[PDB]
Amino acid sequence: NFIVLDKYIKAEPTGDSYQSESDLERELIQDLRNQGYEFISVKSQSAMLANVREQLQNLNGVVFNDSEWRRFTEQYLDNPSDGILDKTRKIHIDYICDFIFDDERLENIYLIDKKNLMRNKVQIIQQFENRYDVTILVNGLPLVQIELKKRGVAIREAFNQIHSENSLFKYLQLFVISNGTDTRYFANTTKRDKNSFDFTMNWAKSDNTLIKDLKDFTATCFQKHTLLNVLVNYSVFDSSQTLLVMRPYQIAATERILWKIKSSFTAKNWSKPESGGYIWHTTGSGKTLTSFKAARLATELDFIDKVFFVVDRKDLDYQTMKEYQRFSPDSVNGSENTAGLKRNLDKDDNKIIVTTIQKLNNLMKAESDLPVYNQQVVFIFDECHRSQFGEAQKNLKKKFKRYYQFGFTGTPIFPENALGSETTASVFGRELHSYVITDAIRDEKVLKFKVDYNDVRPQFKSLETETDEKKLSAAENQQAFLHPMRIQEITQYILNNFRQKTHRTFPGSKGFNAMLAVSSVDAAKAYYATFKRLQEEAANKSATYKPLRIATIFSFAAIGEISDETFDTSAMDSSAKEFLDAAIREYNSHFKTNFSTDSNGFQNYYRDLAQRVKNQDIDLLIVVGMFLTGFDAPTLNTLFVDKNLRYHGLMQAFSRTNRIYDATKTFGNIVTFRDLERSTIDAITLFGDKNTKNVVLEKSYTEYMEGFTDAATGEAKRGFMTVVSELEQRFPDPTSIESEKEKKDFVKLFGEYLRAENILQNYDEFATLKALQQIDLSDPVAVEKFKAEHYVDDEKFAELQTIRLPADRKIQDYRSAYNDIRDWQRTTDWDDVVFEVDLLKS
């Protein structure tokens, strides 16, 4: 009984009228009752408490006297000092209160029955109390809130508007908001960087087709058996205490894995490709969240003995290690050591084993008579890199007698890119579920890429477009790719443009950070050193120079594939080692840390580093092959690439930037100093088809300036220039304004102006054009200063020199105006107007 359906016919409208919020509520409520939600009238917390008493007493087969119930309420149910996070902890972890009654007996009081999900009572109430809302109670507790909006209303603006007491509502797990035509859900979390519209979600079928309109959503997501599985089994509450509600493709993959295990086991058809299967979830879509989740759920199968969750040590980071520490303590790190693996194996009242592919491979190599070999075993592999994985297969196939193995990847191995390895199909069998890039991009769950070769160094162009790889390896030296001029010019470009690319320009904007991925240890050395030196140079010249905080990490290697780097620092050549040494020292001074380069220190440096790049304590991380495949940083938006990336490694590295965040993060910038255009298209095309590139890759500067049609959608989009010109035709102020309808129009228009500028901020052509608005002239030392920093012709100079932009002041007159009109919310009709909330606040 899958909860993400293969098939669903659309409900028919009544109708039976359906404009008004109270129209939507009437039907929602009616529909929910048909589906077996008892409707109750509740007017007060007091009435809710009593209802909870009735429900929990029923659930738990026990009656409180009033003094106990008061005590239960004050100490567990509804502590005055609990907040949302505490209730979520209670729903997800501490849902049993071991209660001691007046007569001194001890009894487990469950808020939810998780084993017998359908035993839970579900009920609905309406808003008690100017806002229509329906709440679903589970055993009396409010866990879902549906916010209802007029058909007119732009869901996003409504979301923008809303997102103790009365204190029971601290239990909400899930929000749904709907204007009838559209319906999105999102988790109730206090974590503000999970709180933007980007994290709201549509319900869907297993082919990922959306289910948008409320009646269909009701009849699907809101089946008791669906809703309660979502709440209880398909929401994650992790170690940073973030509630994440799984998206449909995540649940669809997960349930399909579990059912596959069960039917295999029942068929006694273990230990072949047809016993398991694979999951093609595109890079960044939550493979690691989902696969881990599915391993945890798999432990609940009584007949499975042990569940291995296996990750690649390459993919580890701080959040992720924190998370595994709870299930397999000090056993999931970068080392070859198995001692910890083999100790977790011998724990009992235990079924989950998390480990790396390196470790599992070592263990099975060494190791011949493990009881686990004869047990009923599940393997879930999260994106394991292709070669470590291959030796592991040989032994696992050799050695486990009864297993069901599954893999998640965003970049499968097909016959075409096989060479070396077994295809993914051949290893795992059937594709159980797919959610591919064009899917994720249509759903706005992954960001597009803006990819440009920074072709601005003629001296070195011929190197930078070289295709033969023998030559490319031959050129990794100071004569060629690490010529100190090349390194300088590139590094200068990066210092000149970091703030522009990461949107730290018109600050106090927070903005983003960045990585620089390079071809070799030496490259990283040259770049680190050059950054250091070039920042000393600014620091004297200027002196309100605000330095970027740069760091680097690497060790030792040794297509498609990003080279695996060891965590055994003693493999490195003496000079590499000493440089890493001096960098760690500098890092130690700055952050008051105390790492070293012995293996334990390096591992800890690695771990602190991930944390600090995630939280932007570091501005630029320089890297050879590390943090390129698994590292999760939503506020990283720019990859600088001086590296020969191809195929799956290309897709992975670029994807470091692809995490959604908010309206401020429009796509990931990829700025390359070798020409990666062919490679980029070949890679995208390998993992889609011939059209896939037009969905993944952003449009040209000229297209955002002058207008185009999104072939995906086909939305015609203006035209920053069209926009700017409309603003001036329509709207030079303040008399331009001042009828309400004109205000509406301005808001819509200046909305687009804001979206367009924000997009354009990521184009060198634009940053260049903007800079030219100073200067002048003379000038004309600072004429020359500017030509040289934006790499601009005389020729080009004269061009740019009027394209015409609106004055800064004229803009801040629009701005505050704009803001003005927003604050006086709360003819003419205002339903469909979205304000650029995120972009403003920036």
Ligand X SMILES: Nc1ncnc2c1ncn2[C@@H]1O[C@H](COP(=O)(O)OP(=O)(O)OP(=O)(O)O)[C@@H](O)[C@H]1O
Q: Which amino acids are annotated as binding site for ATP, given as ranges?
A: 281-288
Query: According to the binding rule CB under 5 A, does residue 634 interact with Mg ion?
Result: no
438: partner contacted, choices Mg ion, ligand X, none (Cβ within 5-8 A by kind): none
Strand ranges (E), 190-264: 201-204, 210-211, 235-237, 243-245
Which region among 115-123, 185-193, 602-610, 624-632 touches Mg ion (by CB under 5 A)?
624-632
The smaller minimum CB distance to ligand X, of residues 202 and 285, is found at: 285
Instruction: Characterize the bridge pairing of strands 96-100 and 235-237.
Output: unpaired
The smaller minimum CB distance to Mg ion, of residues 312 and 489, is found at: 312
Residues in 717-756 that interact with ligand X by CB under 6 A: none
Residue 767 CB, nearest approach to ligand X (Å): 29
The smaller minimum CB distance to ligand X, of residues 383 and 466, is found at: 383
Q: Which residues contact 263 (CB under 8 A, 6 or more apart)?
A: none
Residues in 488-517 that interact with ligand X by CB under 6 A: none
The smaller minimum CB distance to Mg ion, of residues 625 and 630, is found at: 630
Query: According to the binding rule CB under 6 A, does residue 316 interact with ligand X?
Result: no
Q: Shortest CA distance to 315 belongs to which of 632, 647, 560? A: 632
The smaller minimum CB distance to ligand X, of residues 188 and 768, is found at: 188
d(CA 161, CA 181): 19
Residue 410 CB, nearest approach to ligand X (Å): 5
d(CA 163, CA 118): 31
286: partner contacted, choices Mg ion, ligand X, none (Cβ within 5-8 A by kind): ligand X
Instruction: Characterize the bridge pairing of strands 133-138 and 141-148.
Output: antiparallel
The smaller minimum CB distance to Mg ion, of residues 173 and 409, is found at: 409
Q: In this structure, what token pair is assigned to residue 445? A: 């769950």
Which region among 286-294, 548-556, 600-608, 770-778 touches ligand X (by CB under 6 A)?
286-294
Among 77, 168, 232, 244, which residue interacts with ligand X (rule: CB under 6 A)?
244
Among 3, 52, 172, 246, which residue interacts with ligand X (rule: CB under 6 A)?
246
Size of interface with ligand X, in residues (CB under 6 A)? 21
Query: According to the binding rule CB under 6 A, does residue 173 interact with ligand X?
Result: no
Query: According to the binding rule CB under 6 A, does residue 289 interact with ligand X?
Result: yes
d(CA 276, CA 289): 19
The smaller minimum CB distance to ligand X, of residues 216 and 315, is found at: 315
Residue 210 CB, nearest approach to ligand X (Å): 16
The smaller minimum CB distance to ligand X, of residues 314 and 790, is found at: 314
Which region among 49-57, 98-106, 152-160, 284-292 touches ligand X (by CB under 6 A)?
284-292
Query: According to the binding rule CB under 6 A, does residue 286 interact with ligand X?
Result: yes
Is the separation of the CB atoms in 671 and 645 below 8 Å? no
The smaller minimum CB distance to Mg ion, of residues 287 and 306, is found at: 287
Residue 424 CB, nearest approach to ligand X (Å): 15
d(CA 118, CA 114): 9
Among 82, 452, 466, 632, which residue interacts with ligand X (rule: CB under 6 A)?
632
Q: In this structure, what token pair is assigned to residue 641? A: 């690439």
Query: According to the binding rule CB under 5 A, does residue 288 interact with Mg ion?
Result: yes
Among 260, 646, 659, 717, which residue interacts with ligand X (rule: CB under 6 A)?
659
Cα 105 to chain center, whole Å?
Answer: 47
Q: Shortest CA distance to 263 belongs to which of 301, 225, 305, 310? A: 301
Q: Please, which residues bridge with residue 123 across strands?
A: 38, 137
Q: Phi and psi for 102 in degrees, rounded to 5?
A: -65, -25
Query: According to the binding rule CB under 6 A, does residue 283 interact with ligand X?
Result: yes
Query: According to the binding rule CB under 6 A, does residue 648 interact with ligand X?
Result: no
Q: Please, which residues bridge with residue 642 across strands?
A: 518
Residue 610 CB, nearest approach to Mg ion (Å): 13
Query: According to the binding rule CB under 6 A, does residue 649 interact with ligand X?
Result: no
Q: Which residues contact 438 (CB under 8 A, 6 or more apart)?
A: 688, 692, 695, 696
Query: According to the binding rule CB under 6 A, does residue 142 interact with ligand X?
Result: no
Among 53, 247, 359, 790, which residue interacts with ligand X (rule: CB under 6 A)?
247
Only one residue has tokens 């030296």, namely 477
Q: Give the residue nearest to Mg ion (CB).
A: 288
d(CA 628, CA 568): 19
Cis check: omega of the bond before 374, within 30 degrees of 0: no
Query: According to the binding rule CB under 5 A, does residue 502 interact with Mg ion?
Result: no
Residue 666 CB, nearest approach to ligand X (Å): 17
283: partner contacted, choices ligand X, Mg ion, none (Cβ within 5-8 A by kind): ligand X
Kindly tell me the sign of the dihedral angle through the C-alpha atoms of 94, 113, 230, 52.
negative
Q: Which residues contact 93 (CB under 8 A, 6 or more apart)?
A: 237
Query: According to the binding rule CB under 6 A, does residue 288 interact with ligand X?
Result: yes
The smaller minimum CB distance to ligand X, of residues 148 and 279, is found at: 279
Residue 382 CB, nearest approach to Mg ion (Å): 6
551: partner contacted, choices ligand X, Mg ion, none (Cβ within 5-8 A by kind): none
Q: Phi and psi for 803 in degrees, rounded to 5?
A: -65, 130
Q: In this structure, what token pair is assigned to residue 494? A: 């990066």
Residue 109 CB, nearest approach to Mg ion (Å): 38
Only one residue has tokens 């989902």, namely 290
Query: According to the binding rule CB under 6 A, does residue 284 interact with ligand X?
Result: yes
Is the separation of the CB atoms in 251 and 433 below 8 Å? no
Q: Shortest CA distance to 279 belongs to which of 429, 112, 125? A: 429
Kindly tell me the sign of the dihedral angle through the C-alpha atoms of 815, 820, 825, 831.
negative
Which region among 14-22, 211-219, 287-295, 370-378 touches ligand X (by CB under 6 A)?
287-295
CA trace torsion 629, 631, 634, 636 (10° rounding): -80
Q: Which residues contact 383 (CB under 8 A, 6 or more apart)?
A: 287, 288, 311, 312, 315, 407, 408, 409, 410, 629, 630
Residue 285 CB, nearest approach to ligand X (Å): 5
Query: According to the binding rule CB under 6 A, does residue 668 interact with ligand X?
Result: no
CB-side neighbour CA atoms (13 Å) of 375: 16
Q: Which residues are annotated as a binding site?
A: 281-288
Q: Give the residue nearest to ligand X (CB).
A: 286
Query: According to the binding rule CB under 5 A, does residue 286 interact with Mg ion?
Result: no
d(CA 479, CA 475): 8
Residues in 392-421 that interact with ligand X by CB under 6 A: 410
Size of interface with Mg ion, in residues (CB under 5 A)? 3
Among 55, 145, 220, 285, which residue interacts with ligand X (rule: CB under 6 A)?
285
Residue 411 CB, nearest approach to Mg ion (Å): 12
Give ∠ CA 586-589-590 in degrees, rounded to 5.
Answer: 85
Is the separation of the CB atoms in 376 and 397 below 8 Å? no
Q: Shortest CA distance to 300 belongs to which of 268, 267, 254? A: 254
d(CA 12, CA 14): 7
d(CA 202, CA 106): 44
Among 511, 630, 649, 668, which residue interacts with Mg ion (rule: CB under 5 A)?
630
Residues in 176-205 that interact with ligand X by CB under 6 A: 199
Among 216, 383, 564, 565, which residue interacts with ligand X (rule: CB under 6 A)?
383
Q: Which residues contact 702 (CB under 8 A, 6 or more apart)?
A: none
284: partner contacted, choices ligand X, Mg ion, none (Cβ within 5-8 A by kind): ligand X
Cα 729 to chain center, whole Å?
Answer: 41
The smaller minimum CB distance to ligand X, of residues 49 and 243, is found at: 243
Residue 440 CB, nearest approach to Mg ion (Å): 14
Q: Shortest CA distance to 84 belongs to which of 92, 73, 74? A: 92
659: partner contacted, choices ligand X, Mg ion, none (Cβ within 5-8 A by kind): ligand X
Instruction: Please report, as ranges, the residues that interact with Mg ion according to CB under 5 A.
Output: 287-288, 630
Instruction: Please report, as ranges, the residues that interact with ligand X according to CB under 6 A.
Output: 199, 244-247, 250, 283-289, 315, 383, 410, 630, 632, 634, 655, 659
